[PDB]
């Protein structure tokens, strides 16, 4: 019935915020995700406005779309909070369309953030900064892994950056039918998501923490190329042939042998032999400390 659900959503007082406390703003992504101001999110501080992102359905959406948004909200409740993931902040579920209120990242996704900061052909990033960005993403993933969550689409596009340059993993709670994914469908930027997938996920559709580590390897490569496009110009069929032959991307120019070996370890052909996010956090912590910020 238009945008009204055939079913009705159960109340959850742990998370419910009155609709009139949410001042809706401009679109951020599509859909749909919109910037809003939330008044009195914290019940201790009722006079404060907090900038938040709000997920909601488009007028087109079906009961299945609603079901998927409810599922993401419920998984976010279960997973709990961490500094390096996008956290659930509240919901409006009653007497109107479902709003899922989550953290706002004012500097947008990591791919654009990195690209905007390439030297001109915007302040440049030091080696330490790039390695700290990798560190934070690995910490977010270590948390998610510890909570038994497999992301399935880890990539710079799904990492968001806050006003204080905190990296936050986004979209870890999405319901996806991996049988139905279009290998030829592209991101809005025109790149192919198959280029982040482990061979076992790609060929046999087996998704594991180990396949997420493969994706993290590609993400590391994205970071040290300042937002480079993996396997540029390569179509799906040729990607499959490259992976069956054991091809691996070349070492980026602005990158140490140790970090490249980390990337290659993430792309181990045998999944059991890849490092764990726990180990990656440990190795990256040591490297951050030993890497120069120039000065
Ligand atoms: C100066 N500035 C440049 C970066 N600018 C920007 C652009 C797009 C942006 N998207 C989000 C965002 C999400 N797309 C998002 C999601 F898809 C799921 C869950 C939470 C989310 N939180 C967000 O904050 N922030 C953005 C900032 C706008 C202004
Ligand atoms: Cl509906
Ligand atoms: Cl918590
Ligand atoms: Cl991308």
Numbering used by the authors: 457 to 486, 490 to 580, 592 to 765
Relevant lines from the article:
Our data, including previously unavailable high-resolution crystal structure of TKI258 bound to a protein kinase, show that TKI258 is a type I inhibitor and binds to native FGFR1 without causing any structural alterations. TKI258 binds in the hydrophobic pocket at the ATP-binding cleft and is stabilised by hydrogen bonds, hydrophobic and van der Waals contacts. The drug engages the enzyme with a total contact area of ~ 60 Å2. Five hydrogen bonds (involving residues E562, A564 and S565) and 10 amino acid residues involved in hydrophobic interactions provide a direct contact between WT FGFR1 and TKI258 and stabilises the drug–protein complex. One water molecule is found to interact with atom N29 of TKI258. When compared to type I FGFR1–3 selective inhibitors and type II inhibitor AP24534, TKI258 occupies a smaller region confined within the adenosine-binding pocket. The structures of TKI258 bound WT FGFR1 KD and FGFR1 KD V561M superposes on apo WT FGFR1 KD with an overall root mean square deviation (rmsd) value of 1.02 (287 amino acid residues) and 1.01 (286 amino acid residues) Å units, while the drug bound WT FGFR1 KD and FGFR1 KD V561M superpose on each other with an rmsd value of 0.36 Å units (293 amino acid residues). The low rmsd values and illustrated superimposed structures in Fig. 2B suggest that the binding of TKI258 to FGFR1 KD does not alter the enzyme structure. Furthermore, the availability of the high-resolution crystal structure with TKI258 can guide further modifications to increase efficacy and selectivity for FGFR while retaining activity towards the gatekeeper mutation.
